Amino acid sequence: FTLSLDVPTNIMNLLFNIAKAKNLRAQAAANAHLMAQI
């Protein structure tokens, strides 16, 4: 990334999605250590 100033639409969407899925699974699989078992 250009000195940390590399957040284009092609990246933003990806980053937004990554953070989206990463946080989802983080607060799901890492919050109750059994919320992602079903």
Domain membership of residue 1 (yes or no) is no
Domain membership of residue 29 (yes or no) is yes
Q: How many domains does the chain have?
A: 1
Give CA torsion, residues 16, 17, 19, 20, to 10 deg: 110
Structure tokens at 27: 């607060």
Contacts 24+ apart (CB under 8 A), 5-11: none
Boundaries of domain holding 38: 6-38
First to last CA, the chain: 38
> 21, 15 in Cβ contact below 8 A?
no
> 25, 36 in Cβ contact below 8 A?
yes
